[PDB]
Amino acid sequence: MLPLYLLTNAKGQQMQIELKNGEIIQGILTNVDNWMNLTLSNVTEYSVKLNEIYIRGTFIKFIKLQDNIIDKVK
Amino acid sequence: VTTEFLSDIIGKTVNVKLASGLLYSGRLESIDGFMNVALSSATEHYESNNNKLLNKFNSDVFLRGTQVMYISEQ
Amino acid sequence: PEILPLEVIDKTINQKVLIVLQSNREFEGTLVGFDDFVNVILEDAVEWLIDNEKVMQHHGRMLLSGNNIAILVPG
Amino acid sequence: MLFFSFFKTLVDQEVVVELKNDIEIKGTLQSVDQFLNLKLDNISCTDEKKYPHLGSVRNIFIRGSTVRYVYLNKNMVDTNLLQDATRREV
Amino acid sequence: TPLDLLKLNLDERVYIKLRGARTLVGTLQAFDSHCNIVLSDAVETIYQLNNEELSESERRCEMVFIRGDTVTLISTP
Amino acid sequence: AILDLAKYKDSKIRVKLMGGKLVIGVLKGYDQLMNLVLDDTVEYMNARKLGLTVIRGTILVSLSSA
Amino acid sequence: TLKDYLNKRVVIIKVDGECLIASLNGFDKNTNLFITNVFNRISKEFICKAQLLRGSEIALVGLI
Numbered sequence: 001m002l003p004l005y006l007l008t009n010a011k012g013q014q015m016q017i018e019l020k021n022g023e024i025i026q027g028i029l030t031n032v033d034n035w036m037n038l039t040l041s042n043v044t045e046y047s048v049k050l051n052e053i054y055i056r057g058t059f060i061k062f063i064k065l066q067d068n069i070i071d072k073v074k
Numbered sequence: 075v076t077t078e079f080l081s082d083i084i085g086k087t088v089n090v091k092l093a094s095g096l097l098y099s100g101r102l103e104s105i106d107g108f109m110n111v112a113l114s115s116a117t118e119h120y121e122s123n124n125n126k127l128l129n130k131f132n133s134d135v136f137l138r139g140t141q142v143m144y145i146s147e148q
Numbered sequence: 149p150e151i152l153p154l155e156v157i158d159k160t161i162n163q164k165v166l167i168v169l170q171s172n173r174e175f176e177g178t179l180v181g182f183d184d185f186v187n188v189i190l191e192d193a194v195e196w197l198i199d200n201e202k203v204m205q206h207h208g209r210m211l212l213s214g215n216n217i218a219i220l221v222p223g
Numbered sequence: 224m225l226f227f228s229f230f231k232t233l234v235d236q237e238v239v240v241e242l243k244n245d246i247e248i249k250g251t252l253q254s255v256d257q258f259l260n261l262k263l264d265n266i267s268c269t270d271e272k273k274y275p276h277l278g279s280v281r282n283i284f285i286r287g288s289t290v291r292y293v294y295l296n297k298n299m300v301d302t303n304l305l306q307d308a309t310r311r312e313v
Numbered sequence: 314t315p316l317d318l319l320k321l322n323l324d325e326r327v328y329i330k331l332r333g334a335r336t337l338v339g340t341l342q343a344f345d346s347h348c349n350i351v352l353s354d355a356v357e358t359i360y361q362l363n364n365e366e367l368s369e370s371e372r373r374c375e376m377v378f379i380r381g382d383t384v385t386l387i388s389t390p
Numbered sequence: 391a392i393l394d395l396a397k398y399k400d401s402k403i404r405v406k407l408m409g410g411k412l413v414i415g416v417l418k419g420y421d422q423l424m425n426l427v428l429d430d431t432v433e434y435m436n437a438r439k440l441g442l443t444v445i446r447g448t449i450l451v452s453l454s455s456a
Numbered sequence: 457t458l459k460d461y462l463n464k465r466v467v468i469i470k471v472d473g474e475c476l477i478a479s480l481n482g483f484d485k486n487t488n489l490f491i492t493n494v495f496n497r498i499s500k501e502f503i504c505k506a507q508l509l510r511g512s513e514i515a516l517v518g519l520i
Contacts, residue, residue, distance in 0.1 A: 135388045302343065
């Protein structure tokens with residue numbers, strides 16, 4: 001099935017996001033839309049603790065999904 | 075307003091800068107929706123016209139939409 | 149209720165404005181007009197290259213394209 | 224739609240494709256789509272250093288944006304038909 | 314209009330500039346709404362600064378397709 | 391919209407832009423396209439203070455609370 | 457199209473530099489690759505059991 005669909009399914013799961021600039025962004029997913037604009041809660045980034053963040057779709061390189069992405073979603 | 079401006083500056087000598095820093099000085103033939111410029115008698119320069127002239131083009135020069143940054147005039 | 153960016157832009161017409169692009173390049177001058185894509189009409193703009201270098205002084209009306217613009221600062 | 228058509232017309236064609244990040248690969252073009260992607264059969268060598276670290280990969284899918292050129296010969300491509308098409312369009 | 318203007322120099326020699334300092338000279342045989350170019354009888358000239366000195370690299374190709382993302386300027390020599 | 395900006399309004403937010411940029415400022419206005427209107431704005435490209443500013447939403451990389 | 461590439465191990469090279477060996481399990485029109493059992497080509501370094509790869513990054517894909 002689709003990646004977007006999977007993302008939608010996994011609402012309230014941990015995922016480490018990587019951007020084009022360099023930084024690592026760890027957080028639990030809250031909401032997803034058609035262009036993959038990722039909103040995370042309980043957010044922490046690396047080379048800073050946050051309550052909530054907004055992440056753009058095009059700026060992402062990849063998303064390190066957890067091992068139980070098939071078990072929880074599907 | 076933009077459209078009006080475009081309409082106005084047809085058949086005038088215009089400074090057109092691209093993303094790389096190449097300033098094009100020449101007579102404006104035409105321009106359309108995505109900001110694709112059509113110059114004529116163009117004389118390209120690095121940054122400013124006071125600096126050295128690299129190449130000269132008597133024929134109708136074409137500047138692409140995504141590359142162009144602004145269209146000024148003398 | 150909430151203040152729109154478009155409204156702000158409109159308000160800044162016929163006043164001095166500093167338009168910062170995504171690259172380390174800036175433009176300072178008087179605002180004439182705009183549209184939905186933020187394709188700014190800037191009268192007598194001064195081209196700055198930051199980190200400051202004065203590039204070129206424009207004597208006319210500059211159509212600043214809406215792709216490269218990052219920040220718009222009235223005054 | 225002109226360019227897509229042209230691409231389609233080049234079905235089954237051994238052609239070299241130079242990508243953005245110094246990757247030059249030869250192959251027999253199979254499938255063509257709206258955004259101008261290339262699936263090439265039988266990947267062969269062009270240069271020694273530029274050609275990437277592959278070996279057993281016989282079928283690929285090139286992302287249409289990352290291609291710099293599609294290196295045709297003078298006996299492998301349309302021209303004034305394309306011109307005509309362009310003229311017809313606005 | 315600009316596109317239309319480029320219909321004149323079809324089937325004659327042209328000068329095309331790309332991103333990455335890649336000069337391409339041939340004859341214009343194709344373009345479209347996105348400015349994808351196909352040159353015949355062509356010859357490429359690659360400017361490449363290496364080891365703090367200038368050095369051109371000539372790639373001779375009697376035909377070449379060019380994607381519109383790379384294109385910057387089209388003219389005549 | 392997925393990110394409601396009513397709670398972020400009248401509070402110091404930290405926004406990122408493309409081409410190596412960082413802009414901290416108090417969120418005064420917003421819209422559906424994520425174009426912001428920041429008051430008390432300070433760009434940290436070390437430092438660069440501004441007055442009332444308008445941030446675009448076609449190159450808005452990231453946004454967080456502060 | 458990447459319909460023949462589903463449920464099969466594939467070599468995927470990015471725009472920046474890296475190359476990944478992994479099982480492709482999903483695709484869309486924007487070339488966002490849903491991938492399982494991720495590994496690096498040169499390093500042979502296990503990143504993770506599942507991930508999403510954005511279409512902007514994909515320079516090349518290869519069936520194997």
